[PDB]
Amino acid sequence: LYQLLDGDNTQKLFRTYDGLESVAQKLSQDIASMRDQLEVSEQEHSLLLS
Amino acid sequence: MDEKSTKIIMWLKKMFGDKPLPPYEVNTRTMEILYQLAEWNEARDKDLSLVTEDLKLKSAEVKAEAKYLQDLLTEGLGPSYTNLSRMGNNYLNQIVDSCLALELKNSSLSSYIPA
Amino acid sequence: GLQQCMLVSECSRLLTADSVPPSDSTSILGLDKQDLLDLLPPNMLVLWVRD
Amino acid sequence: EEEVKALQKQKNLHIRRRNKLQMVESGNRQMCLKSKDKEEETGRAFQEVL
Amino acid sequence: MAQTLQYVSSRLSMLQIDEEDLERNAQFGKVLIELCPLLGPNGGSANLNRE
Amino acid sequence: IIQESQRLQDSIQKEVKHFSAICLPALLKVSTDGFNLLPSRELSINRMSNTHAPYYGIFKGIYESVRLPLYKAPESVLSHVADMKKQLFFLRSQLSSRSEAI
Amino acid sequence: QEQIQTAEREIVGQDLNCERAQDLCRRSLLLRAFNKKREEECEALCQSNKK
Numbered sequence A: 001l002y003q004l005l006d007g008d009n010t011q012k013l014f015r016t017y018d019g020l021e022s023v024a025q026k027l028s029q030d031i032a033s034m035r036d037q038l039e040v041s042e043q044e045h046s047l048l049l050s
Numbered sequence B: 001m002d003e004k005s006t007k008i009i010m011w012l013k014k015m016f017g018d019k020p021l022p023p024y025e026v027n028t029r030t031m032e033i034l035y036q037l038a039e040w041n042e043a044r045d046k047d048l049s050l051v052t053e054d055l056k057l058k059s060a061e062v063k064a065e066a067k068y069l070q071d072l073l074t075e076g077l078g079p080s081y082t083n084l085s086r087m088g089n090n091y092l093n094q095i096v097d098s099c100l101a102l103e104l105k106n107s108s109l110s111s112y113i114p115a
Numbered sequence C: 001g002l003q004q005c006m007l008v009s010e011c012s013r014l015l016t017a018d019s020v021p022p023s024d025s026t027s028i029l030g031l032d033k034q035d036l037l038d039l040l041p042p043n044m045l046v047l048w049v050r051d
Numbered sequence D: 001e002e003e004v005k006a007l008q009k010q011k012n013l014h015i016r017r018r019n020k021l022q023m024v025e026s027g028n029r030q031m032c033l034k035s036k037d038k039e040e041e042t043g044r045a046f047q048e049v050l
Numbered sequence E: 001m002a003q004t005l006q007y008v009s010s011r012l013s014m015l016q017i018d019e020e021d022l023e024r025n026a027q028f029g030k031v032l033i034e035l036c037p038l039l040g041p042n043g044g045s046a047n048l049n050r051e
Numbered sequence F: 001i002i003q004e005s006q007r008l009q010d011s012i013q014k015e016v017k018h019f020s021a022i023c024l025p026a027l028l029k030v031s032t033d034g035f036n037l038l039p040s041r042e043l044s045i046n047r048m049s050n051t052h053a054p055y056y057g058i059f060k061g062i063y064e065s066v067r068l069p070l071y072k073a074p075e076s077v078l079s080h081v082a083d084m085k086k087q088l089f090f091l092r093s094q095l096s097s098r099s100e101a102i
Numbered sequence G: 001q002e003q004i005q006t007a008e009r010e011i012v013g014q015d016l017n018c019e020r021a022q023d024l025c026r027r028s029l030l031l032r033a034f035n036k037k038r039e040e041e042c043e044a045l046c047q048s049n050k051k
Helices: A002-006 A017-049 B002-016 B028-077 B086-101 C002-015 C033-037 C043-050 D002-049 E002-011 E019-024 E026-038 E046-050 F002-007 F011-020 F056-065 F074-101 G002-014 G019-050
Strands: F029-031 F037-039
Touching: A002 A017, A002 B028, A002 F074, A017 F056, A017 F074, B002 B028, B002 E026, B028 C002, B028 E019, B028 E046, B028 F029, B028 F074, C002 C033, C002 C043, C002 G019, C033 G019, D002 G002, D002 G019, E002 E019, E002 E026, E019 E026, F011 G019, F056 F074
Parallel strands: none
Antiparallel strands: F029 F037
């Protein structure tokens, strides 16, 4: 699960459960942030069209 | 451009195996598209491998637990718990099939209702 | 009767770490499966409960 | 109109399901209180064995 | 050509491919069609998806 | 005799004290590969089975972070996270396409 | 839907796992079985003292 979330084979010598929850929160935040950017971009596009 | 090109050629060789790489128009755009595709495929292949290995592990663990519960019930309730009436078996199968359809953790109402 | 049958079964299993007979493995509290089976209700009551 | 009918049906459904849930919740709450009493009884039986 | 695009876009939903790309690059389009079966609907390798 | 009798002095109490400290479920060992007996509580499928399981609080937190419902089977967590990553890639591609179009 | 979700969170929170009561029952049974074995051992020492 940690490998799936961090992508980076950075052989972190010590994986913690708290670290796992943090990386999971980051993915959710990244998706939310990307959706917000897309929404902004959609507004920008709509303004240009208007 | 020379590094991306190498990655694409290696990736295409991997995908087409023993089949000669088909000739295609090598321009800046075709290379970018192929490069995005190669990056995407590589990232997904990695994810799918990890999921596949985990499912194998989970299949083993579920099997072990199934055996445990079966043994527990046989020893506690006797072999007679498996000799349910036709309707009883139908009811059991429907609960089981409903739970599988909703991908539930267990057959409790606390899981079924929210699902 | 049913509660007792389930409990005995659960506890029997706690004892029987399906492990490999090691002829030498120290049971918890020195109890064997047979020590628990003795705490089952009478065989007539067990059959009645299962039916 | 069909949508209004469909949404009304859905509303009725959600109301029925909410009611059922409230029943299940009340029933479970009662069961949880009684289970605490069992824990206390079994706790006494355990002290007798000790 | 429009059919090839639709096919590639449906299977490779991530690829932003325009009709101009396939018109200027006919042999490239053939490569993409050949890659589509090798790549599952989700961008993963067909073998790994089967597994 | 005095020496051996002293060894057995309060023997019942000593054993009961050690027993009271043990976790019973830790005794339930299951073999997944036929060779290695692991406690059933340590199995990945049971991390969410009971509110009293040692790792329940941690995984509850992980489920909520990835927006996976608690009623879902534990075997679904990796597949779900993989899909989320897939979605992230798709959203990035859409943003890039839209930014180019603008 | 907000009301249903609140009620759902409550049911999930009430998931009565009587694991503590069950643990006590298991322990009680095991200790009863242990007591019986220790009574047999006491009877054996009593016989030795008579001799």
